[PDB]
RNA sequence: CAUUGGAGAGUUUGAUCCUGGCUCAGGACGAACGCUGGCGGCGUGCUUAACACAUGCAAGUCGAACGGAAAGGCCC
């Protein structure tokens, strides 16, 4: 539909009591728009879909933005929430998203397509999710990098990699008209 | 004054997170084995006993260095 999700994980957690255990669902639910809005929530229910629909509607309201570069990574990011940690490298065109289960969901759904991205430290899905979560939120793109520096984007970030915006701003462009 | 490049999964608990080992998905081979087997092209083929070897062959050539004449070859 609208918003793009998957759903990377869903878990069986059981509360015991004096009668037994009372089991519920835990469901990780990424959603994003694919161009750049993307975000992650966290479900309990009693019940599957319904753990599923609390997460997504949980993580509605956790959209944050990520810069592109021309579909792809602005620049080479590392983060870590807990013991997660994810490395995140900008790829050539076509190179696809070259990353683990978790964080390929996460950043499908944030709309990059040519990505390298390893998962160094614990493999826990809501762990590693978190941590491609702040990696992208470490993100920094080059106009607001120059207005941190008190400079040009000519002056600061290199060439390439500003043709390159120009050219996926050109094939915008295109498929836009084309529609 | 950009890059040609990096994927995980299972398993400790009633449940969780971490630590952590174990196991698996990939590629490879001078390989062997099992089942099966049409052809062609290009390679490769004793990794162990530097263990012991029947048989044939694998280093000869020169008469324009020499005496020669055992064969073939010409002349009697
Ligand atoms: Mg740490
Ligand atoms: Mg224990
Ligand atoms: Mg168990």
Redesign the pocket.
Known sequence: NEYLERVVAI??????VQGG?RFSFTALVVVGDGEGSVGVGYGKAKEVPAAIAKAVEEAKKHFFKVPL??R?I??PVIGEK???VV?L???????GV???????AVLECAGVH?V?????????????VHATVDALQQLEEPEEVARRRGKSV??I??????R?RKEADEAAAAARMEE
């Open positions: 878990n069986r957690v059981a509360k015991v255990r570069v021309g792809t602005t620049h807990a013991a997660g490395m490298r900008p790829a050539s065109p076509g190179t070259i990353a683990g289960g978790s964080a390929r040519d390298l991205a390893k998962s160094l430290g614990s493999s826990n899905a809501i762990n590693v000519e002056d970030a290199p060439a390439a990699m500003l390159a």
